[PDB]
mmCIF file of C-alpha atoms and ligand atoms in Angstrom:
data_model
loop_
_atom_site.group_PDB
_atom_site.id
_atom_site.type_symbol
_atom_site.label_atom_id
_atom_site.label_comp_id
_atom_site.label_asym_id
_atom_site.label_seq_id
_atom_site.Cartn_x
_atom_site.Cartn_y
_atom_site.Cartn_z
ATOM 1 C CA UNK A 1 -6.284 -3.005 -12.319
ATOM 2 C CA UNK A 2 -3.702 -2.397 -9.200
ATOM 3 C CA UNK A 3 -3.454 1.708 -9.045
ATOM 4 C CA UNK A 4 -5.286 3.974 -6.654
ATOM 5 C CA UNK A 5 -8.345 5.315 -7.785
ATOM 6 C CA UNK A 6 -10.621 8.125 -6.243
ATOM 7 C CA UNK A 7 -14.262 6.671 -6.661
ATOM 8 C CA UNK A 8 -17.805 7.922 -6.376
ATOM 9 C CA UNK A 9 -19.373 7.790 -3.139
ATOM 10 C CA UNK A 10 -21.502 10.747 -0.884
ATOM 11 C CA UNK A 11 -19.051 10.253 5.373
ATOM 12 C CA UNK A 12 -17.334 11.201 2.719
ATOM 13 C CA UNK A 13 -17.970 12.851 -1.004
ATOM 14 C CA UNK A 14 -16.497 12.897 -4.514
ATOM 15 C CA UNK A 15 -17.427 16.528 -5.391
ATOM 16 C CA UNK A 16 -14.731 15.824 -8.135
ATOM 17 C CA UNK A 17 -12.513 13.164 -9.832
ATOM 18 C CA UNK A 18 -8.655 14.549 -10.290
ATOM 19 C CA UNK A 19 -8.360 12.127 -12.521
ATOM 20 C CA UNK A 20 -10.669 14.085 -15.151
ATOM 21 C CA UNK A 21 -9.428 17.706 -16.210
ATOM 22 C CA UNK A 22 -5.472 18.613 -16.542
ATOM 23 C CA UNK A 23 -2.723 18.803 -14.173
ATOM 24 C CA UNK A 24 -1.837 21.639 -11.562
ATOM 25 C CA UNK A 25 1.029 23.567 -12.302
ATOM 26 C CA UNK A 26 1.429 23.868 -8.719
ATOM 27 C CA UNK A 27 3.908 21.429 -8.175
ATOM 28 C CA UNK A 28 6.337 21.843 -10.946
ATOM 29 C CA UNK A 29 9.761 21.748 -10.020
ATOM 30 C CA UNK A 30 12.945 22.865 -11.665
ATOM 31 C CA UNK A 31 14.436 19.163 -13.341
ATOM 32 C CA UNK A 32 17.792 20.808 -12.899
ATOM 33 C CA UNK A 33 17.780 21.033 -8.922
ATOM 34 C CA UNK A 34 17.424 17.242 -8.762
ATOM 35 C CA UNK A 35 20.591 14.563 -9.163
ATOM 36 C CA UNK A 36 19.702 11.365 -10.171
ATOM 37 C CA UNK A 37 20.704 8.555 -7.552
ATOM 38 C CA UNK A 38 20.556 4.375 -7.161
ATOM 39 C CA UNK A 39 18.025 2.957 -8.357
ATOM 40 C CA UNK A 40 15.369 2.041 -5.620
ATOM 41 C CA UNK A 41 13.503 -0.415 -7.881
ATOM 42 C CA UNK A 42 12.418 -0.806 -11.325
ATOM 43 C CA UNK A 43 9.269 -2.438 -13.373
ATOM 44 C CA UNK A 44 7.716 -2.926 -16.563
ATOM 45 C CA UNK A 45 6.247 0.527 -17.388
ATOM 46 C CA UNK A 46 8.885 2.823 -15.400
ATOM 47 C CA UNK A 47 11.079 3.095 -12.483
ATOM 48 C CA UNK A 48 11.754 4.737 -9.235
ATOM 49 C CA UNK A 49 15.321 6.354 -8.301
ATOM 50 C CA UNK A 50 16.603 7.675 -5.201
ATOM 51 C CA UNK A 51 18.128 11.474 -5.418
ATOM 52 C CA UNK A 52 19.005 14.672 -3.684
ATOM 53 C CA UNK A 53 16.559 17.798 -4.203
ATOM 54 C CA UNK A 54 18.090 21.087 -3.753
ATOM 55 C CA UNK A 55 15.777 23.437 -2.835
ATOM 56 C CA UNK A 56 13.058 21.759 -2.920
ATOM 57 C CA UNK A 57 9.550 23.004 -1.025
ATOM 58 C CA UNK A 58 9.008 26.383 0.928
ATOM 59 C CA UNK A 59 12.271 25.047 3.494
ATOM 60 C CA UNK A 60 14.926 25.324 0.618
ATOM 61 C CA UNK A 61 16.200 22.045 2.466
ATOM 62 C CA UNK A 62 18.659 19.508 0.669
ATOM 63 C CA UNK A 63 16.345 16.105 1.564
ATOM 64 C CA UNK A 64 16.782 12.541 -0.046
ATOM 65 C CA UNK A 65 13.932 12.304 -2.471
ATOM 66 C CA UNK A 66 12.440 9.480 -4.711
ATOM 67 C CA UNK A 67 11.555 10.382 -8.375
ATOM 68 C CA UNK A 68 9.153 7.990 -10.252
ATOM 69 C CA UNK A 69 9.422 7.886 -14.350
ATOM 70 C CA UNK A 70 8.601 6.129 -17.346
ATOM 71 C CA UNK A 71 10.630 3.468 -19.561
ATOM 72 C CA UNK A 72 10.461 3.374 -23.394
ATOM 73 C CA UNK A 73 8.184 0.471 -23.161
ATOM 74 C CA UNK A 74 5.267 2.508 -21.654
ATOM 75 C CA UNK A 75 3.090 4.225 -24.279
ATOM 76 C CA UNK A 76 0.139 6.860 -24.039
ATOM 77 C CA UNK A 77 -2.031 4.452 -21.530
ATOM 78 C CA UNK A 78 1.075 4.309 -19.278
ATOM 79 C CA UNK A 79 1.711 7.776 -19.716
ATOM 80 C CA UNK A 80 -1.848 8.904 -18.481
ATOM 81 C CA UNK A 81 -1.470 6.518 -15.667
ATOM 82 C CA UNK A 82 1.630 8.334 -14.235
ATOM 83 C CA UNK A 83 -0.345 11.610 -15.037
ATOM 84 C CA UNK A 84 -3.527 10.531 -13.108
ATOM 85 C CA UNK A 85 -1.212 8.866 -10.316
ATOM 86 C CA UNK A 86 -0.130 12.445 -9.848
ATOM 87 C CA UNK A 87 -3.219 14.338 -10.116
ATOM 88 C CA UNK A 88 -4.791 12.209 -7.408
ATOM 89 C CA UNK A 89 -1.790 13.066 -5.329
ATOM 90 C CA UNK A 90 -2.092 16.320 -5.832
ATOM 91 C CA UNK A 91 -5.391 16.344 -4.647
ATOM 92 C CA UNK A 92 -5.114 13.716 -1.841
ATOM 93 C CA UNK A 93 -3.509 16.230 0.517
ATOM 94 C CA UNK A 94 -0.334 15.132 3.006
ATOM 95 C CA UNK A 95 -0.741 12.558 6.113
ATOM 96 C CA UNK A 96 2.085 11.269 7.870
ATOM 97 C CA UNK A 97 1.955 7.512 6.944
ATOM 98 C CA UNK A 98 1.532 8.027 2.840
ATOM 99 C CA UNK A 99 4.376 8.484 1.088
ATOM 100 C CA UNK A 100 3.600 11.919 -0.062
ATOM 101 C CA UNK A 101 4.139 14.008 -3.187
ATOM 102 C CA UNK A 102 6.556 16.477 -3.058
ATOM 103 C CA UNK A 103 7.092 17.615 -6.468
ATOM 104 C CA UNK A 104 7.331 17.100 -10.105
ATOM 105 C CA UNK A 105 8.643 18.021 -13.304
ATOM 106 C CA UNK A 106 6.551 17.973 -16.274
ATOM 107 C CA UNK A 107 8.432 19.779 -19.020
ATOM 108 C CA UNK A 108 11.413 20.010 -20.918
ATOM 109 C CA UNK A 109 11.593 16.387 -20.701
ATOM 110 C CA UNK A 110 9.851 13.271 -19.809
ATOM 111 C CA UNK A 111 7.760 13.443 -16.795
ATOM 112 C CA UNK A 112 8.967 13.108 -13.124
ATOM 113 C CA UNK A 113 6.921 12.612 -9.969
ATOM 114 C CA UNK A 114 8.823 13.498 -6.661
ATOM 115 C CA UNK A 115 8.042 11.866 -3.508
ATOM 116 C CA UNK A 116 8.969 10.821 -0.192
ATOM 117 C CA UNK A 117 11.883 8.920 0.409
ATOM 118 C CA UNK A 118 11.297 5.869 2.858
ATOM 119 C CA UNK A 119 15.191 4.980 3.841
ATOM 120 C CA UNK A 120 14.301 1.381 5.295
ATOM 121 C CA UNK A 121 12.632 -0.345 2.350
ATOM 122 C CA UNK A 122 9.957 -2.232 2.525
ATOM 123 C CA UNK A 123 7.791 -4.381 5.369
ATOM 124 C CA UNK A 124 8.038 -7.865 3.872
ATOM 125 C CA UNK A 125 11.580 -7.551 3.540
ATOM 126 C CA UNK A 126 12.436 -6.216 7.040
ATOM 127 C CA UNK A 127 9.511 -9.132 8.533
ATOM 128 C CA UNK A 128 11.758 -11.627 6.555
ATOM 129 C CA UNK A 129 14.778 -10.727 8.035
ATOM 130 C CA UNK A 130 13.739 -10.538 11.689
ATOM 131 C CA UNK A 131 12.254 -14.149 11.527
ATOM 132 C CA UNK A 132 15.427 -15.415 9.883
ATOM 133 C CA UNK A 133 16.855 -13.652 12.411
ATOM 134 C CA UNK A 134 14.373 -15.514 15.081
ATOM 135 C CA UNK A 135 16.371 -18.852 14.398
ATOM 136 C CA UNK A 136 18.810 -16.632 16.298
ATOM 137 C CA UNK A 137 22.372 -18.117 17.083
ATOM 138 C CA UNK A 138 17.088 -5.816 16.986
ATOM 139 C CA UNK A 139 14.170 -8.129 18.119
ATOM 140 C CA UNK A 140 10.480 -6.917 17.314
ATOM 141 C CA UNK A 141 8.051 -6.774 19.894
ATOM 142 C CA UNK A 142 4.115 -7.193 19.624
ATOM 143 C CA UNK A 143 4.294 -3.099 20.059
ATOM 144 C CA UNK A 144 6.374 -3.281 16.903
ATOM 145 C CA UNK A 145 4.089 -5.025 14.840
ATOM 146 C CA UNK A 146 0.874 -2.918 16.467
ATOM 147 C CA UNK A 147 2.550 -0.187 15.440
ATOM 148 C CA UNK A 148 2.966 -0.824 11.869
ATOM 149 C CA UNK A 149 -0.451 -2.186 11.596
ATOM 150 C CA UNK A 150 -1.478 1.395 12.742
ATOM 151 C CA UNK A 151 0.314 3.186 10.937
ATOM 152 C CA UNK A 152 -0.852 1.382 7.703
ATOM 153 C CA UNK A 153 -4.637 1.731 9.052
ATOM 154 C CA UNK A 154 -4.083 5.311 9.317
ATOM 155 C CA UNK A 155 -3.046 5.486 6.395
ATOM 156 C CA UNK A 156 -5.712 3.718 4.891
ATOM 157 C CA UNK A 157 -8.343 5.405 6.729
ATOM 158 C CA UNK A 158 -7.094 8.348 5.276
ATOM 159 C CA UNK A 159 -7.403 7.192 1.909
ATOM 160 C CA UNK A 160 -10.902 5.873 2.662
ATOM 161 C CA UNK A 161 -11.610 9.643 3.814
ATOM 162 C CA UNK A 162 -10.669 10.896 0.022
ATOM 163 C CA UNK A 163 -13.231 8.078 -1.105
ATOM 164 C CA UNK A 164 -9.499 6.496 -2.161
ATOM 165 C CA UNK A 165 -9.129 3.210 -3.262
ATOM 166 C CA UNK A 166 -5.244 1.633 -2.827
ATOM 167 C CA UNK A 167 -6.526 -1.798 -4.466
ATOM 168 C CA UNK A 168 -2.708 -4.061 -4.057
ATOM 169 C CA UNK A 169 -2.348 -3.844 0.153
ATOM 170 C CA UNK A 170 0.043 -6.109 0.466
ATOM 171 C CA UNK A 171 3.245 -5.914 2.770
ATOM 172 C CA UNK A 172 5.530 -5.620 -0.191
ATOM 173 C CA UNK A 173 3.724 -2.473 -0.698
ATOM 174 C CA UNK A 174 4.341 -0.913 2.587
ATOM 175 C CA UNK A 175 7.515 0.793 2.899
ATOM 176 C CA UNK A 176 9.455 1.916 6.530
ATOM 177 C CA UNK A 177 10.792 5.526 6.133
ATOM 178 C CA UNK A 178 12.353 7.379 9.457
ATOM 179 C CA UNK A 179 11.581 5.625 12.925
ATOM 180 C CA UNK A 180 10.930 2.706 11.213
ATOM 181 C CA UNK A 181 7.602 4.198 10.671
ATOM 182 C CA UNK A 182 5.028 2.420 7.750
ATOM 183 C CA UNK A 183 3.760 4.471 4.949
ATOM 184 C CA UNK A 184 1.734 3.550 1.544
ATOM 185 C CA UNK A 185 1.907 4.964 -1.914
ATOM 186 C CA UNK A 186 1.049 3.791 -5.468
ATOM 187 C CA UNK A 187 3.984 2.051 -6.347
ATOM 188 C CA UNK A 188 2.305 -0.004 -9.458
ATOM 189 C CA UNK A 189 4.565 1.527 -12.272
ATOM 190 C CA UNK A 190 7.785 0.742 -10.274
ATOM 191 C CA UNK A 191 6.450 -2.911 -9.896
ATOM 192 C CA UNK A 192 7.549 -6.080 -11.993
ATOM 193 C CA UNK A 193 3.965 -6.762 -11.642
ATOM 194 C CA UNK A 194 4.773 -8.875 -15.123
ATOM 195 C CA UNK A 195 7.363 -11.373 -13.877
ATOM 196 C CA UNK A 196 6.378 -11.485 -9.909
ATOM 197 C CA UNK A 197 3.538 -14.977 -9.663
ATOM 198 C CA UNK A 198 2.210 -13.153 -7.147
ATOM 199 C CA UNK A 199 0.268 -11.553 -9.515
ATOM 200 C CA UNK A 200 -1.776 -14.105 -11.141
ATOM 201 C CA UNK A 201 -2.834 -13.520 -15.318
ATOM 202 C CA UNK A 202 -6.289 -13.417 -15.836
ATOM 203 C CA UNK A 203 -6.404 -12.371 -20.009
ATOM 204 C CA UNK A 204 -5.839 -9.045 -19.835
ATOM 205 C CA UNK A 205 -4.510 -8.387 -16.443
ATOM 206 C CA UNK A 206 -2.262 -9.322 -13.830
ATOM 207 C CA UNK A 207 -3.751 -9.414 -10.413
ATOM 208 C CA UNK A 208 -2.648 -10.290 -6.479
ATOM 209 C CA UNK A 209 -5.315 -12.455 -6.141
ATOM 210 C CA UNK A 210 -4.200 -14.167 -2.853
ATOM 211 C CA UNK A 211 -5.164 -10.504 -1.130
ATOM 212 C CA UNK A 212 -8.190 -9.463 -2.893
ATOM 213 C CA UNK A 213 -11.559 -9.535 -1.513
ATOM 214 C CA UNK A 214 -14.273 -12.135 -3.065
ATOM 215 C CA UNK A 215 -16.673 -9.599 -4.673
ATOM 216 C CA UNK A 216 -13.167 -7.927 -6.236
ATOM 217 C CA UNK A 217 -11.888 -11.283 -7.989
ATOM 218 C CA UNK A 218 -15.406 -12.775 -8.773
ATOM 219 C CA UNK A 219 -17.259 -9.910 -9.559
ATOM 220 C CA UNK A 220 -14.606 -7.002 -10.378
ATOM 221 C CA UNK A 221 -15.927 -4.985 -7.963
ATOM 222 C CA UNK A 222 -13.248 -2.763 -5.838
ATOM 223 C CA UNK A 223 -14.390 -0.161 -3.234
ATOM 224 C CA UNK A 224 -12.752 0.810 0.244
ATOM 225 C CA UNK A 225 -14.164 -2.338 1.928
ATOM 226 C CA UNK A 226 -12.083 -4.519 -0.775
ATOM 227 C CA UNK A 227 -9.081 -2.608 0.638
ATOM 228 C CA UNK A 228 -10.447 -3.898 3.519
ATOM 229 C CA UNK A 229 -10.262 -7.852 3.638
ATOM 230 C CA UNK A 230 -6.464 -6.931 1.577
ATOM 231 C CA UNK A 231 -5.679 -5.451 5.170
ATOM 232 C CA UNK A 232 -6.555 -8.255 6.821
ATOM 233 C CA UNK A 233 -4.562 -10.262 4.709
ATOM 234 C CA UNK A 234 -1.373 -7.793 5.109
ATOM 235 C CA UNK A 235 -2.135 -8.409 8.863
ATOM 236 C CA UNK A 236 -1.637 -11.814 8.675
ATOM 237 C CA UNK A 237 1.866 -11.316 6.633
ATOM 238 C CA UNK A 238 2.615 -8.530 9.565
ATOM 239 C CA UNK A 239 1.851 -11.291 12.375
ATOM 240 C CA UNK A 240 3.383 -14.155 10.963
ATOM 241 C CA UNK A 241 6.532 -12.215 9.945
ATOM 242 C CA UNK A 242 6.212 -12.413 6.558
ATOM 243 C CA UNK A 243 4.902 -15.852 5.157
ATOM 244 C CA UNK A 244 3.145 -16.260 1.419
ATOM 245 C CA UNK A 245 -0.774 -16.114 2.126
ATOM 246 C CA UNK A 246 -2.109 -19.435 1.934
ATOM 247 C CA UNK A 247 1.244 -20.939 1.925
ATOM 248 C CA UNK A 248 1.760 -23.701 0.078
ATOM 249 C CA UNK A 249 -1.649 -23.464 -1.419
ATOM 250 C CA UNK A 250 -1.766 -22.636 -5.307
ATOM 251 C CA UNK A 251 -4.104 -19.841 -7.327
ATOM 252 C CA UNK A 252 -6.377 -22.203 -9.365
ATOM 253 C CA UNK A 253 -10.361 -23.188 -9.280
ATOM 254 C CA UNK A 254 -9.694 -25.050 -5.802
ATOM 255 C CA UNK A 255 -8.544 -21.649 -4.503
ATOM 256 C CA UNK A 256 -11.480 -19.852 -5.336
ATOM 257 C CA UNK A 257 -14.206 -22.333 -4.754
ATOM 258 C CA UNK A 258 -12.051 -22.202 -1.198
ATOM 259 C CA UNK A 259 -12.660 -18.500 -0.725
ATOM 260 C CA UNK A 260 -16.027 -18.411 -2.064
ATOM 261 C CA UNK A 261 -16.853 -20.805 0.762
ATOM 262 C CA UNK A 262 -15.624 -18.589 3.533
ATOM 263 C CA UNK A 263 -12.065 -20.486 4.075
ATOM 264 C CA UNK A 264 -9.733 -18.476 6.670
ATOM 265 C CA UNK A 265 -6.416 -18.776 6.768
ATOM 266 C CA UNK A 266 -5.340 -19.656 10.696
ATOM 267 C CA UNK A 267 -4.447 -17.541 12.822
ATOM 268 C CA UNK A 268 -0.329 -16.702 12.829
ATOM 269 C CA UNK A 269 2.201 -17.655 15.254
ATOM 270 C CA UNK A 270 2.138 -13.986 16.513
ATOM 271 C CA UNK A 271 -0.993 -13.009 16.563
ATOM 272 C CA UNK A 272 -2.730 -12.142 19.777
ATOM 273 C CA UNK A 273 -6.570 -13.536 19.698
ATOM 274 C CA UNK A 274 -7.512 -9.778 19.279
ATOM 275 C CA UNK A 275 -5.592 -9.223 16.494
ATOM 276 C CA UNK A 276 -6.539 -12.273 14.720
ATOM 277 C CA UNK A 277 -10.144 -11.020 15.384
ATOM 278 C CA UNK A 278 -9.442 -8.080 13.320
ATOM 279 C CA UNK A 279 -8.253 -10.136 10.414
ATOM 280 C CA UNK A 280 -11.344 -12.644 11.132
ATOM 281 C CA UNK A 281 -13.414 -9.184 10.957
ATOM 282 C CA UNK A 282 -11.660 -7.558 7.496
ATOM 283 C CA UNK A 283 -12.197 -11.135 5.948
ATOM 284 C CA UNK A 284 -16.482 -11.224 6.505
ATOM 285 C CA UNK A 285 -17.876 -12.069 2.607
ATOM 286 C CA UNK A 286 -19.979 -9.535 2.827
ATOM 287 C CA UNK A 287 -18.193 -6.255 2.050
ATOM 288 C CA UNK A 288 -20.780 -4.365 4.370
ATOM 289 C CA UNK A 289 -20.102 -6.658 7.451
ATOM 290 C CA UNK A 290 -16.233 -5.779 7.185
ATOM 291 C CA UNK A 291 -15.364 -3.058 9.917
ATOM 292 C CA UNK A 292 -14.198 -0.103 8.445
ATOM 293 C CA UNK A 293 -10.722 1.184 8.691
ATOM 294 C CA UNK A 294 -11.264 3.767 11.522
ATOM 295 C CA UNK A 295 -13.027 1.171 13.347
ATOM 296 C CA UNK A 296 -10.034 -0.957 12.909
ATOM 297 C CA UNK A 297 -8.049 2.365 13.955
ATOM 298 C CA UNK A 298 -9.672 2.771 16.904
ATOM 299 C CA UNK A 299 -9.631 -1.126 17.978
ATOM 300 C CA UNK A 300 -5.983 -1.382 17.296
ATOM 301 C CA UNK A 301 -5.303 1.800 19.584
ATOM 302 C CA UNK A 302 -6.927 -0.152 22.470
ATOM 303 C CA UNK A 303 -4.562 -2.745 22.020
ATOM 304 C CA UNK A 304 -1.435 -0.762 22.256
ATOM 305 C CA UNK A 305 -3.055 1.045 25.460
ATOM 306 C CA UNK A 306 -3.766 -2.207 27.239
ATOM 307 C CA UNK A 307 0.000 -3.559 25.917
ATOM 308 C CA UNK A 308 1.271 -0.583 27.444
ATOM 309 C CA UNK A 309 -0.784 -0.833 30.714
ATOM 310 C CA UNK A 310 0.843 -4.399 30.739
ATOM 311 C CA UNK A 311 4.328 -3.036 29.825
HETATM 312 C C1 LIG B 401 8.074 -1.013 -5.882
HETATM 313 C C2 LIG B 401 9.226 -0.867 -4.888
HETATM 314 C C3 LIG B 401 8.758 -0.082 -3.663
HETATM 315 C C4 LIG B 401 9.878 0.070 -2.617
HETATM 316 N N1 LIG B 401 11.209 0.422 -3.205
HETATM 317 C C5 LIG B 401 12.213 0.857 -2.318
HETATM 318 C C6 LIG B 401 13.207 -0.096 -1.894
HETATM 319 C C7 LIG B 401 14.190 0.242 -0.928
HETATM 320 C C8 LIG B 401 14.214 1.546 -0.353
HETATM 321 C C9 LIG B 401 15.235 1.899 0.699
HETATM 322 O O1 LIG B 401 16.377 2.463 0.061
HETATM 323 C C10 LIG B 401 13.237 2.510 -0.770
HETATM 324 C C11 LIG B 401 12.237 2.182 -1.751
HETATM 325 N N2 LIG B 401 11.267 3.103 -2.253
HETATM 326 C C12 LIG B 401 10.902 4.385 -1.885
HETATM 327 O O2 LIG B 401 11.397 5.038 -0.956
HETATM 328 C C13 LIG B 401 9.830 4.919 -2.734
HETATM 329 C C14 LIG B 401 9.123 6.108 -2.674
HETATM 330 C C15 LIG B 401 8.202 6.105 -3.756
HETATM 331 C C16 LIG B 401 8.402 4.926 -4.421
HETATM 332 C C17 LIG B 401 7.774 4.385 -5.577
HETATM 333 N N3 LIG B 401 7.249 3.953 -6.522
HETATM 334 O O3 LIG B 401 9.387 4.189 -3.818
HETATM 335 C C18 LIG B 401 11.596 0.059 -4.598
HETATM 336 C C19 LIG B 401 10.394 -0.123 -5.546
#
């Protein structure tokens, strides 16, 4: 699969899966207050729109919200997935680089799950454009790119704290709200997971192969230290501003046998040695030899203190 999952684990503990038992009424919201706005992106199972929320939260406050919903194409297993998507973020609790829930409406229609609205778009897109733009004729700096590689490890050390599994970190899945600043959300159900070949077929699935860990592909095994060797491979998309993971280099039995044998992608064109160490570090076969992501937290803030020392 590609959602976020709460799993079973006891630094942290699972004293209960929000998944299991019904939804908290403590986030409905009236399906009136909310006008319906572009479209921000659309997949198989449902969509996600941009719109204005009047009155929504305790500060009565007009904000640009996005509301995620379903399509006629999704069924009851799509439905329950949108239903368990927001019963995990109802239980998850707010941090500032997730894109948070802020509401939804779950009757007298078809269900709606308000979140955050990230302005910018997403990371691979805005890497893109500043490398095109590097062939020059705004200019990120390796602050810049700490930053959002921060940002997204707070995030995901959050997560890890919930005993939260993201399973797809990929760039395309990081989006820049406000300040330019990173955040990460399930966004599966507003995916064309279908018709994008990043997502490889494998019978009864569709999976991002090129960013999942070893045991994950080979063994269908997903915890937080999957998530982990997927960050390292969204760092090297961060630090080479935006290339296609193993570029030029195809998803069949070469690939694998490739991985399996500890191949590395090299280190990117921006990349300081200590950053490429972290990827080097998030990419170690064995899932318990992979630093975790407050480790990586920590490391990266030592970067950005000694950049700053530099100036
Ligand atoms: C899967 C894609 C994720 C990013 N995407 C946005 C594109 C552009 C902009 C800037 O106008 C914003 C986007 N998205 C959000 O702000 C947002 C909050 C929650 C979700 C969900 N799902 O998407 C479209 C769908």
């Amino acid at each position: 699969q590609v959602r976020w999952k709460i799993i079973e684990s006891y630094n942290s503990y699972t004293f209960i899966d929000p998944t299991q038992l019904p939804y908290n009424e403590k986030w409905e919201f009236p399906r009136n207050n909310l006008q319906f706005g572009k479209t921000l992106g659309a997949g198989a199972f449902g969509k996600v729109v941009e719109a204005t929320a009047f009155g929504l939260g305790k500060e009565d406050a007009v904000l640009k919200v996005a509301v995620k919903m379903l399509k006629s194409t999704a069924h009851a297993d799509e439905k329950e997935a949108l239903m368990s998507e927001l019963k995990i973020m109802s239980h998850l609790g707010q941090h500032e680089n997730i894109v948070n829930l802020l509401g939804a409406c779950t009757h007298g229609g078809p269900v709606l799950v308000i979140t955050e609205y990230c302005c910018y778009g997403d990371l691979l897109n805005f890497l893109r454009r500043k490398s095109r733009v590097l062939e020059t004729d705004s200019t990120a700096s390796t602050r810049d790119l700490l930053h959002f590689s921060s940002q997204v490890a707070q995030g995901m050390a959050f997560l890890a704290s919930k005993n939260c599994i993201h399973r797809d970190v990929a760039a395309r899945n990081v989006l820049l709200t406000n300040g330019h600043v990173a955040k990460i959300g399930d966004f599966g159900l507003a995916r064309d997971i279908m018709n994008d070949s990043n997502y490889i077929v494998k019978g009864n699935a569709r999976l991002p192969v090129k960013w999942m860990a070893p045991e994950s592909i080979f063994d269908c095994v997903y915890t937080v230290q999957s998530d982990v060797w997927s960050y390292g491979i969204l760092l090297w998309e961060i630090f080479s501003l935006g290339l296609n993971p193993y570029p030029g280099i195809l998803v069949n039995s070469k690939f694998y046998k490739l991985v399996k044998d500890g191949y590395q992608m090299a280190q990117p064109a921006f990349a300081p040695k200590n950053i490429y160490s972290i990827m080097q570090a998030c990419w170690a076969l064995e899932p318990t030899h992979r630093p975790t992501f407050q480790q990586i937290c920590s490391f990266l803030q030592e970067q950005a203190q000694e950049d700053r020392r530099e100036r």
